[PDB]
Design a protein around this ligand. Structure first.
Ligand SMILES: Cc1ccc(NC(=O)c2ccccc2C)c(O)c1
Length: 435
């Protein structure tokens, strides 16, 4: 009760104070054979996080660490195997009997408790985003069984509160996934969740649309810019896993982008988002046309939209801000691969009119950006910045293999930059071997 509250309050210390476990998930896994009972006392944890102290309190850092360890205990219990990167795998009678029971306990528990956790820590992005990893492991049918409808409203009350307080990519993406999980995976609750959502959205589209109109008509306030980007972000986040096509968002994005090309004076994050949103709008328009039995005008309407957007993305390569160029490029290398001749695979030859071949002028810019923004001259930030350029190239690499860009002009650049490996490599190899 308080005995297990000591063991866990010291476990959060042993993890934070010693460098002996860098990864929470690995720590929990290592103790799991020996210390399962203790590590599945979720009532003990949720207590320590919600209670007020008598004496000694918890530190913001230690709180964050309990939340993180907790989620890792919830996963290991649900999945009933060591985490990604410690695995090997056939449960026995009892192992499976235990798993079902653990899933029951953490669902029955967290349905009640997770609304309250979110409540208290509502403004802590890192904490909120880590708590929202928990529903995926719910036995969601129990939002019926336990007559627990009151608590599902309570999660949704709190998820609404978070998205309304937050603009960080981690929180919103975390909130979005949670809605996807609460939806599809049991009809019983699907209808209730669907409404809380499409009302959540409506409030944000009305807010975005007014902001957009505010911005463009205006001299343009620091607020005008706050409001446009603030709302857009919430919607872009959601539009990846949520089919927001019914709200014509592509329209206002396309205006913001067009205003930022024209008068050259659109803030860099508005543009990047405005893009990423448009792109999600387009992918969703495509799916409805793939799975439907679509008409001639249908194809030709989406086509006109795609060709107008491919031009925006191309144009946005010229934007001063390199975050824009990177996005612009990343979408160009995606879109040109999607609306390639591959689109006519699986007897879907009806889609010919959608296919796009990128011109010389565009191909010469898709080379430009590589030479300028992959292959540059000159701590934690830089290993991350590298894997990005890596991805930017790997996504351009796909266009080279299927001759969507001039493959010869590309390999000529790959010559020019790999020179010092062709020209001096052997000599540097055998040298470093003998030291
Ligand atoms: C995703 C995202 C990023 C940034 C912002 N907002 C701001 O940057 C902002 C707003 C008003 C006054 C000062 C600042 C710095 C936002 O709303 C959404």
């Amino acid at each position: 009760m308080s005995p297990n509250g000591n063991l866990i309050r010291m476990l959060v210390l042993f993890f934070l104070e010693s460098e002996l476990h860098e990864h929470a998930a690995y720590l929990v896994d290592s103790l799991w054979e020996s210390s399962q009972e203790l590590l599945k006392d979720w009532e003990c944890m949720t207590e320590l996080l919600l209670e007020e102290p008598v004496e000694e309190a918890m530190s913001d850092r230690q709180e964050s660490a309990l939340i993180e360890l907790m989620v890792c205990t919830i996963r290991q219990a649900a999945e009933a195997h060591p985490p990604v990167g410690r695995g090997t795998r056939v449960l026995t009678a009892k192992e499976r009997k235990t798993q079902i029971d653990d899933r029951n306990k953490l669902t029955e528990h967290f349905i009640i408790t997770l609304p309250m956790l979110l409540s208290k820590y509502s403004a802590d992005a890192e904490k909120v985003a880590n708590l929202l990893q928990i529903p995926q492991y719910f036995d969601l049918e129990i939002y019926s069984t336990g007559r627990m409808e009151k608590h599902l409203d309570a999660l949704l009350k709190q998820i609404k509160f978070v998205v309304e307080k937050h603009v960080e990519s981690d929180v919103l993406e975390a909130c979005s996934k949670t809605y996807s999980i609460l939806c599809s995976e049991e009809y019983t609750i699907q209808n209730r969740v669907d409404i809380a959502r499409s009302q959540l959205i409506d409030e944000f589209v009305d807010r975005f649309n007014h902001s957009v109109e505010d911005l463009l008509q205006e001299e343009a306030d620091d607020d005008d810019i706050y409001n446009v980007l603030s709302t857009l972000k919430r919607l872009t986040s959601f539009h990846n896993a949520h089919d927001l096509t019914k709200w014509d968002l592509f329209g206002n994005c396309y205006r913001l982008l067009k205003t930022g090309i024209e008068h050259g004076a659109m803030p860099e994050q508005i543009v990047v988002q405005a893009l990423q949103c448009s792109h999600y709008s387009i992918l969703w328009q495509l799916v409805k046309i793939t799975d439907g039995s679509p008409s001639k005008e249908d194809l030709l309407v989406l086509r006109k939209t795609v060709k107008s957007f491919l031009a925006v993305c191309q144009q946005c390569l010229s934007n001063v801000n390199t975050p824009v160029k990177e996005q612009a490029f990343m979408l160009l290398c995606d879109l040109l691969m999607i609306f390639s001749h591959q689109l006519m695979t699986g007897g879907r030859e009806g889609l010919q009119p959608l296919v796009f071949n990128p011109d010389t002028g565009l191909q010469s810019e898709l080379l430009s950006f590589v030479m300028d923004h992959v292959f540059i001259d000159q701590e934690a930030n830089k290993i991350e910045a590298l894997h990005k350029r890596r991805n930017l190239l790997a996504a351009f690499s796909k266009l080279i293999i299927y001759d969507i860009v001039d493959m010869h002009a590309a390999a000529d650049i790959f010559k020019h930059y790999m020179k010092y490996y062709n020209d001096y490599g052997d000599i540097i190899k055998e040298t470093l071997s003998k030291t």
